[PDB]
């Protein structure tokens, strides 16, 4: 159904017509019969030995070695083909088109980059990729199954004694299914076993009751496996059936049926792998630092609104200046040329290894009195040493970046370094002083010589202890920096004081930095929760950041790495060179564990629209997708299904924007009925949980919601053979138009709060559902079954007693008391959690309640007070009537006094872990979220947790804020 012009290899052109679902073999076969009716058809050869070549919509000249693709999958620019003979590696041209489809950009664009740091990274990162493929391939085929199906366990084998008491005498009852007959005879075997036996001792009893191992255990309904030896109660599945009163269902498979669905995969080195005097130390120069500003190419300023412009510079070591800033002279807006040496109060040998130049072009309006009005136009940052330890010399050109929305400072020391890859932007010319040689930064044997050149009981061990346990954003005076630095040899006794002793160093003094290096080299390791603080933007030094990465690689478990993977991907934007120890650590982990590799993929992929990071993250996606094995085909199917839904919902947003739910809901059933939409959106793994495999779509139930941005309710079958024990429908919201990064962070914090409360002796049950961000304001939301908003229950039930009558109607008699104690232990968690995070505008459209009484909050949006940078709670009298069991005096019962004791206990246990929550927000400052831009925006958490008060003055601050949110409306 389209004319395709075909350029034969004898200078002749043809107009061939084909149907749009035709493979390349079909069109190629059809071409050399229509071509024998043309003049020089005896020069040609047989159809083989030829292939096609064309241009794609990403401006790529593409050779189609894969003859089974079809005419509509090609993404051509113009409808034409061309016959040539095949030059190139055939198995390698096929992998490059799969990799380029997953990450969203052609792999050929990386070859056309001339930066030698970029080309060093590409071939030097292939060394990590090879050492992992040898590691997940060592003891086979077991080691290959552990990679694909890794154990989802807890970090700790010991049960909280309040969880242990839900097991009678340390016994668990399990139901072990066995499919025996060829006609699916489902046998069940109920057992009772110690909570700490291993899965080879569980199987050993299921065989005696039915009358190396030959069998594995699987979770019925979701293809999770128990392969590695652990106590049974440490797997998160068995651990979550002990604290919910449910029964675990396990099915007894055979090893040969799992080992045989593992497709083998091999790693081969790419094409670019095969490809490819007198020096002065930094510490022998004797001169101040100076830089020359030549001119700016163009700036977009009006002549009748702005008087002058100038260039503002500064030297920085991670957010702090190393000297006072220096301006140029103010010139007229139409002649930006300065030709001016600027002089800095930094001496050349006193520059630290992570110094940067930060500059902006600024305008002066003034024009009214004396208080001049200054405003930045464009910013840019430069490293003063490059990735080979060389000080930068000679002329330089730099394209600048637009000011971030919501910023008014004059410099931007937290932005990225490098030129704007767009080139029709303001370009500023620079000039660095030349010292008749190549100048290198010293090496650490010369630095240890200098430390030993510039180089007893006490009773104030109690001042070092008080400083050690203080907030990561607490004030430090000048007297305490002098005190910390002079007692620096006894601080190795309080190993967790290292973050505070590093902010006492003078970094513009090479004598003090040399002594600090010798002191980090012998430092005792610290907990991975405390080493993650050393990886944000206040600690740029590379000797400090390698100490932090070494503490993670010894003490961070896969369980906690999954917990903290969002933050470990944002601090990649802070590293100053492409090749570094944090990127080698994270890539090693994602190539030995697909649960980690799955989410590592989607967190980098969702930020490829960002031009400040796209080349960094693109080179790293290229390296993962080249060694991930057979999992690149699963990812390719998830990218095709997501791109179908983005294209579909774009139609509903700007072509059906005004229509009604009848004409739109019929367009949707049209579009989804097409047989190509039906193959993309059916039979793929879920991105929210890659253990949940989606099946046949259920089109009758899919619908267009009436929420803000009109998301998609979608519904799949669970194709598992024992799906009936677990759920049977995967229901997912697709949303296109909302930023889902504040919700991922909110839902991650709540899952950390709950774990602190569970390990204290409290049972406040949270519901942190699934949420994933896949691109620029597009994402996926897990749906909870058997749940209603408070607003549905109030309308269906029609008053203030509606919710309590609904909740008794659903469960009668002996189980009315368990429905009341679960509504109460749930409402106390979301009451404390939403106060600490600053989450407001809670109403009956964004609070939901299950059938069994449990409660949860949804659709958070803005978390800190981003609006004001009181509205008493309106459902207060409705939840009081539930908490007091429908009594008459709600606020005076013994049941309401236990509601308050649980909130007080939960508030004071989060306040004991305030440093963990300060750091998780600090690691997100360059993320790009508008609520979280400076260290001034994290100050909200220090107010609600009352960190400057004492423990009794804080609790009275909580009681006084809750009383102000009482009955209200």
């Amino acid at each position: 159904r389209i004319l395709v012009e075909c350029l034969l290899p004898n200078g002749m052109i043809v107009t061939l017509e084909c149907l749009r679902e035709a493979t390349l073999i079909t069109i190629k076969h059809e071409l050399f019969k229509e071509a024998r009716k043309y003049p020089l058809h005896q020069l040609l050869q047989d159809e083989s030995s030829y292939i096609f070549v064309s241009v794609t919509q990403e401006a790529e000249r593409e050779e189609f070695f894969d003859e089974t693709r079809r005419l509509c999958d090609l993404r051509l620019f113009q409808p034409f083909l061309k016959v040539i003979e095949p030059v190139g590696n055939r198995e390698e041209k096929i992998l490059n088109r799969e990799i380029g489809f997953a990450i969203g950009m052609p792999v050929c664009e990386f070859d056309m980059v001339k930066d030698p740091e970029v080309q060093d990274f590409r071939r030097n990162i292939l060394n990590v990729c090879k050492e992992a493929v040898d590691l997940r391939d060592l003891n086979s085929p077991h080691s290959r199954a552990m990679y694909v199906y890794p154990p989802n366990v807890e970090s700790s084998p010991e049960l909280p004694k309040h969880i242990y008491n839900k097991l009678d005498k340390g016994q668990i009852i399990v139901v072990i299914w066995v499919i025996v007959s060829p006609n699916n005879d489902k046998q069940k075997y109920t057992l009772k076993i110690n909570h700490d036996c291993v899965p080879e001792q569980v199987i050993a009893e299921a065989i005696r009751k039915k009358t190396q191992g030959k069998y594995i255990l699987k979770v019925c309904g979701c293809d999770e496996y128990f392969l590695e030896k652990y106590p049974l109660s440490q797997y998160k599945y068995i651990r979550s059936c002990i604290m919910l009163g449910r029964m675990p269902n396990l099915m007894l498979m055979a090893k040969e049926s799992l080992y045989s669905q593992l497709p083998m995969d091999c790693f081969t080195m790419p094409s670019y792998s095969r490809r490819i005097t007198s020096t002065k130390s930094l510490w022998v120069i004797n001169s101040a630092l100076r830089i020359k500003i030549l001119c700016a190419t163009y700036v977009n300023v009006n002549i009748r609104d702005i008087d002058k412009i100038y260039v503002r510079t500064g030297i920085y070591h991670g957010g702090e200046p190393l000297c006072d800033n220096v301006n140029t002279q103010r010139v007229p807006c139409s002649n930006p040329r300065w030709n001016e040496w600027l002089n800095y109060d930094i001496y050349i040998p006193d520059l630290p290894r992570a110094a940067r130049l930060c500059l902006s072009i600024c305008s002066v309006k003034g024009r009214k009195g004396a208080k001049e009005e200054h405003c930045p136009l464009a910013w840019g940052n430069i490293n003063l040493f490059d990735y080979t330890d060389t000080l930068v010399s000679g002329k330089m050109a730099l394209n600048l970046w637009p000011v971030p929305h919501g910023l008014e400072d004059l410099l931007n020391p937290i932005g990225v370094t490098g030129s704007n890859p767009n080139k029709e932007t303001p370009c500023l010319e620079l000039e660095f002083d030349w010292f008749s040689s190549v100048v290198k930064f010293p090496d650490m044997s010369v630095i240890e010589e200098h430390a030993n050149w510039s180089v007893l009981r006490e009773n104030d061990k109690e001042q070092l202890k008080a400083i050690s346990t203080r907030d990561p954003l607490s004030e430090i005076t000048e007297q305490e920096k002098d005190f910390l630095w002079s007692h620096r040899h006894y601080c190795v006794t309080i190993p967790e004081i290292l973050p505070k002793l590093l902010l006492s160093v003078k970094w513009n003094s090479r004598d003090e930095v040399a002594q600090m290096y010798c002191l980090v080299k012998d430092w005792p390791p610290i907990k991975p929760e405390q080493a993650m603080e050393l990886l944000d933007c206040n600690y740029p030094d590379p000797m400090v950041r390698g100490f932090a990465v070494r503490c993670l690689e010894k003490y961070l478990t896969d369980d906690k790495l999954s917990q903290y993977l969002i933050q470990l991907v944002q601090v990649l934007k802070y590293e100053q060179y492409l090749d570094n120890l944090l990127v080698r650590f994270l890539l090693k982990k994602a190539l030995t564990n697909q649960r980690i590799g799955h989410f590592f993929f989607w967190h980098l992929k969702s930020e490829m629209h960002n031009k400040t990071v796209s080349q960094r993250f693109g080179l790293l996606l290229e390296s993962y997708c080249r060694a991930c094995g057979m999992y690149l085909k699963h990812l390719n199917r998830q990218v095709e299904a997501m791109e179908k839904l983005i294209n579909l919902t774009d139609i509903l947003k700007q072509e059906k924007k005004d229509e009604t739910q009848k004409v739109q809901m019929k367009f949707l059933v049209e579009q989804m009925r097409r047989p190509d939409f039906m193959d993309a959106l059916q039979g793929f793994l879920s991105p929210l949980n890659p253990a949940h495999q989606l099946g046949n779509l259920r089109l009758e139930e899919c619908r267009i919601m009436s929420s803000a941005k009109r998301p998609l309710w979608l519904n799949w079958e669970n194709p598992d053979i024992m799906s009936e024990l677990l759920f049977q429908n995967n229901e997912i919201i697709f949303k296109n138009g909302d930023d889902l990064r504040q919700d991922m962070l909110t839902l991650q914090i709540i899952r950390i709060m709950e774990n602190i409360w569970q390990n204290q002796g409290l049972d406040l049950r949270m519901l942190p559902y699934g949420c994933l961000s896949i691109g620029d304001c597009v994402g996926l939301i897990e749906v909870v079954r058997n749940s209603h908003t408070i607003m549905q229950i109030q309308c269906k039930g029609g008053n203030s007693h509606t919710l309590h009558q609904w909740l008794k109607d659903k469960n009668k008699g002996e189980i009315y008391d368990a429905a009341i104690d679960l509504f109460t232990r749930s409402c106390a968690g979301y009451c404390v959690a939403t106060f600490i995070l600053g989450i407001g505008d809670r109403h009956n459209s964004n609070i939901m309640v299950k059938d069994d009484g449990q409660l949860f909050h949804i659709d958070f949006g803005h978390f800190l007070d981003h609006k004001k940078k009181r509205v008493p709670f309106v459902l207060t009298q409705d939840f009081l009537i539930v908490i007091s069991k429908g009594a008459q005096e709600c606020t005076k019962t013994r049941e309401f006094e236990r509601f308050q004791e649980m909130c007080y206990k939960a508030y004071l246990a989060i306040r004991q872990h305030a440093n963990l929550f300060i750091n998780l927000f600090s690691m997100m400052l360059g993320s790009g979220m508008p609520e979280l831009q400076s260290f001034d925006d994290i100050a909200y958490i220090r107010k609600t947790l009352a960190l400057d008060k004492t423990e009794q003055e804080a609790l009275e601050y909580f009681m006084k804020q809750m009383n102000d949110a009482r009955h209200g409306g």
Partner: protein, 276 residues
């Protein structure tokens, strides 16, 4: 007489937050200072904040038994005396690495007078003037920032399409250079012996190629003209945002200084959320 009360000093600010002092020492000469209450909110602590070397230094004032000062030999009668001892002697007498004097005190009555007419009948109207003009600017700014990112994304689509034409045109022209030298001097001239092959097979073919080659060069040229026009409106929307951005910092400062000198100080008025 230079030892007045600490509550009437110009450089004393009471209880203001740490992040509200960072908005007053931002890009000021080395030697600017003020004093406030310590963050603990226990009275008699008095942290001093000094600007020096591009940074904000933070120095504690101790209170042994009616004395004041920096170190343990507290030898001053009061804070106002201590501040005056160092407005004439450099701070190198305390720390040699801190060679600077207290030069430029951040006064409270220099900028608080930026507002005038402490009536409530006046400033309510002057607050109404600014709160209307301020938020009318933000309705004109954040509209432009919306048109700015949309014009940026359409510039980038066009530039990729121009690269798609350049690679497409590059293979036709190499396809007509094999039409002749590969075939049209050694098969056409050799066998020209009264054939009907010439005018149809070779000529008619090669003349529908050139009709197709130039039709591609006419769509590239039509797109290249909408990119020049599209890159000119993108610089006019970036000039206008550069002249609105300065006007809109001045309004917020002249507008917020009203809310915190008459409506919250001159009268405890819950009408401020009702004025607006």
């Amino acid at each position: 007489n230079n030892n007045m009360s600490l509550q009437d000093a110009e450089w004393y600010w009471g209880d203001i937050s740490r992040e509200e002092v960072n908005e007053k020492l931002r890009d000021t000469a080395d030697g600017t200072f003020l004093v406030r209450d310590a963050s603990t909110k226990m009275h008699g602590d008095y942290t001093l904040t000094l600007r020096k070397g591009g940074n904000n230094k933070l120095i504690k004032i101790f209170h042994r038994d009616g004395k004041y000062g920096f170190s343990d030999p507290l030898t001053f009668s009061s804070v106002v005396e201590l501040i005056n001892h160092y407005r004439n002697e450099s701070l190198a007498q305390y720390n040699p690495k801190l060679d600077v004097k207290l030069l430029y005190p951040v006064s409270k009555y220099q900028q608080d007078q930026v507002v005038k007419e402490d009536n409530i009948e006046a400033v309510g109207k002057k607050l109404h003037e600014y709160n209307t003009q301020f938020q009318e600017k933000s309705r004109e700014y954040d509209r432009l920032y919306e048109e700015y990112t949309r014009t940026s994304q359409e510039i980038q689509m066009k530039r990729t399409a121009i690269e798609a034409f350049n690679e497409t045109i590059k293979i036709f022209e190499e396809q007509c250079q094999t039409q002749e030298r590969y075939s049209k001097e050694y098969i056409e001239k050799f066998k020209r012996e009264g054939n009907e092959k010439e005018i149809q097979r070779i000529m008619h073919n090669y003349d529908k190629l050139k009709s197709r080659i130039s039709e591609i060069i006419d769509s590239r040229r039509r797109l290249e003209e909408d990119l020049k026009k599209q890159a000119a409106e993108y610089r006019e929307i970036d000039k206008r945002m550069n002249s609105i951005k300065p006007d809109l910092i001045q309004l917020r400062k002249t507008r917020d200084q009203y809310l915190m000198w008459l409506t919250q100080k001159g009268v405890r008025q819950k009408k401020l959320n009702e004025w607006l």
